[PDB]
Design a protein around this ligand. Structure first.
Ligand SMILES: Cn1cnc2c1c(=O)n(CCCn1c(=O)c3c(ncn3C)n(C)c1=O)c(=O)n2C
Ligand SMILES: Cn1cnc2c1c(=O)n(CCCn1c(=O)c3c(ncn3C)n(C)c1=O)c(=O)n2C
Length: 377
């Protein structure tokens, strides 16, 4: 009935000490689908990007030995990858053919159940206007090559899914929604990074509803607006997967006296000691900040927490907000939840004193998957 899709990132292995996260750290009963971020591309063919990716693939796909129902996908692209290889690859039927062949081969060789396209984004960040429609052609041709490959080797079809924009402008210049929706198995909407320090004021990473003071285009930066846009503009509810972030965005306050939503800010907040990401803290890093006696807030209109101390403020998601969004997604009949990322939840259980994978476990319980079988073949 609901999917729970979880991204695993292949650079989490480089975090120090308790933050290091490898495929073996994934509980195979937790998610219904796991997505490996990221593969890359070289002369129009899918390829690995870390020296040890093949060893990781093996361990990641090997979790399917513990839970025969689990599916895995490989994600290509992401933020840093940009758009240039995608633009060149989609630009001719030959480049597309080259790529699609490389993928069926890669995916079968290392035992993935599908590909998740994370092009960020067709039509933006240097990608020319023709890419909007070329992305559709790619996806159609891929879905079709998958259909024919399943008939000519008699196994179930590889899946094709896509992680897609939450920005209205990015959506508009990027996607033929009705057509994409025909050929994609799932649509993973990146409903997070909806606010952050680049804006110059405090704001939530992934608020469910708008702030009562949000007007004009600021009224579009919430999960409700974004998922309703996708749905009303042609995507079937059941293929639409709501993104949930297991991290939050932090800011430097311009005035440690003004600590509400919309308070002015002077820049990104500090990198955490584990993910080392400027302007971002993993949920387990934020739990450290809370133990440190940060003042806890609740943004009641948008249903998400925030916290602050001295001149550092952070808006994030906790068990409460994840539960609330998960009830909402069920009421609205979406297909399920996607989580970025499994390595940013409190996976050891030792930072938050809420059990192992508190955030993602909340979703497993709320989406009624507590009883999902976890048995080998
Ligand atoms: C598709 N997608 C869906 N949600 C996402 C992304 C995404 O790409 N990124 C941005 C991910 C940036 N990044 C990389 O891409 C990346 C990396 N190291 C190697 N790569 C290749 N790092 C340290 C990094 O930070 C996110 O932060 N989120 C929430
Ligand atoms: C306008 N801007 C400036 N910094 C930004 C943004 C922004 O819009 N977003 C919302 C999501 C898109 N995005 C960026 O734009 C972005 C970025 N790294 C550098 N930039 C520029 N990343 C990882 C990113 O995901 C960000 O996350 N960051 C950090």
């Amino acid at each position: 009935a609901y999917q729970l899709t979880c991204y695993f990132t292949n650079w989490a292995q480089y975090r120090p000490g308790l933050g290091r996260f490898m495929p073996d750290d994934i509980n195979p009963c937790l998610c219904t689908h796991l997505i490996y971020a990221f593969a890359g591309m070289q002369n129009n063919e899918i390829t690995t990007i870390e020296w040890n990716d093949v060893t990781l693939y093996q361990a990641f796909n090997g979790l399917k030995n513990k839970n025969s129902q689990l599916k895995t996908l490989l994600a290509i692209g992401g933020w840093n990858f940009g758009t240039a290889p995608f633009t060149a690859m989609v630009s001719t039927p030959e480049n597309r053919q080259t790529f699609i062949t490389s993928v069926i081969k890669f995916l079968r060789q290392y035992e993935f159940d599908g590909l998740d396209f994370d092009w960020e984004y067709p039509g933006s960040r240097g990608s020319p206007p023709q890419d909007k429609h070329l992305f559709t052609v790619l996806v159609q041709e891929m879905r079709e090559a998958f259909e024919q490959e399943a008939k000519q080797i008699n196994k179930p079809r590889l899946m094709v899914t896509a992680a897609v924009a939450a920005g209205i402008s990015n959506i508009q210049s990027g996607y033929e929604i009705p057509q994409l929706s025909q050929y994609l198995d799932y649509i993973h909407v990146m409903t997070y990074d909806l606010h952050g320090s680049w804006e110059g004021y405090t704001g939530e990473n992934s608020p469910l509803y708008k702030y009562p003071t949000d007007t004009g285009s600021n009224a579009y930066l919430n999960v409700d607006y974004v998922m309703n846009y996708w749905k009303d503009n042609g995507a079937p509810a059941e293929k639409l997967i709501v993104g949930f972030p297991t991290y939050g965005h932090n800011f430097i306050l311009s005035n440690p006296s003004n600590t509400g939503i919309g308070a002015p800010t002077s820049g990104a907040g500090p990198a955490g000691p584990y993910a080392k990401e400027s302007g971002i803290w993993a949920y387990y890093e934020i739990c450290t900040f809370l133990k440190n006696g940060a003042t806890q807030g609740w943004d009641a209109p948008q249903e998400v927490p925030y916290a602050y101390q001295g001149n550092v403020w952070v808006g994030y998601d906790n068990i409460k907000s994840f539960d609330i969004k998960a009830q909402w997604l069920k009421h609205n009949k979406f297909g399920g939840a996607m989580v970025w990322a499994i390595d940013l939840d409190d996976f050891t259980g030792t930072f938050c004193n809420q059990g192992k994978f508190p955030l993602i476990s909340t979703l497993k319980k709320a989406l009624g998957l507590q009883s999902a079988s976890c048995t080998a073949p």
